[PDB]
């Protein structure tokens, strides 16, 4: 019934439903402020899941853009949703360009004093042939400090 639900259903995504829904969410974030819109939070979660099966560059880029913006103000749900999209999405369908973004956002997250991104990056890499790809050498040191 709520757009998030019917847009995620099988064969239930329509451009028309989605676009009104999106603007409503962005309007509410503008109206109420960063971190204060629960509707915004639902959009982050929608993007997180939907992009796994139905990638769209434009949607993906906004998702990332808004996530980083919110996180800079200390509101992290968006970025958390982003790291789950990277970690879970890449294990399902790997994409080189997205993997490079995952490395980029993980290093920044780590250098900002957080471990959420690094753990998600390790959870994916540990079990993937992606570990044999060219990894940011700084990220590789950060992953070294992950011994148990």
Swiss-Prot record:
Transmembrane segments: none annotated. The modification N6-acetyllysine is found at residues 20, 145. Residues 1-148 are annotated as: Interaction with mRNA. It comes from the Eukaryota. It is found in: Cytoplasm; Cytoplasmic granule. Phosphorylated on multiple Ser and Thr residues in response to active mTORC1. Phosphorylation is important for interaction with RPTOR and the mTORC1 complex. Phosphorylation promotes dissociation from the 5'UTR of mRNA molecules with a 5'TOP motif. Interacts with PABPC1/PABP. Interacts with EIF4A1. Interacts with RPTOR. Recruited to the active mTORC1 complex via interaction with RPTOR. Inhibition of mTORC1 activity strongly reduces interaction with RPTOR and the mTORC1 complex. Identified in a complex with mRNA, PABPC1, EIF4E and EIF4G1. Found in a complex with PABPC1 and SHFL. Belongs to the LARP family. The C-terminal region mediates interaction with the mRNA and polysomes. It is required for translational repression of mRNAs with a 5'TOP motif. RNA-binding protein that regulates the translation of specific target mRNA species downstream of the mTORC1 complex, in function of growth signals and nutrient availability. Interacts on the one hand with the 3' poly-A tails that are present in all mRNA molecules, and on the other hand with the 7-methylguanosine cap structure of mRNAs containing a 5' terminal oligopyrimidine (5'TOP) motif, which is present in mRNAs encoding ribosomal proteins and several components of the translation machinery. This is La-related protein 1. It comes from Homo sapiens (Human). The chain holds residues 873 to 1020 of 1096 of the full protein.
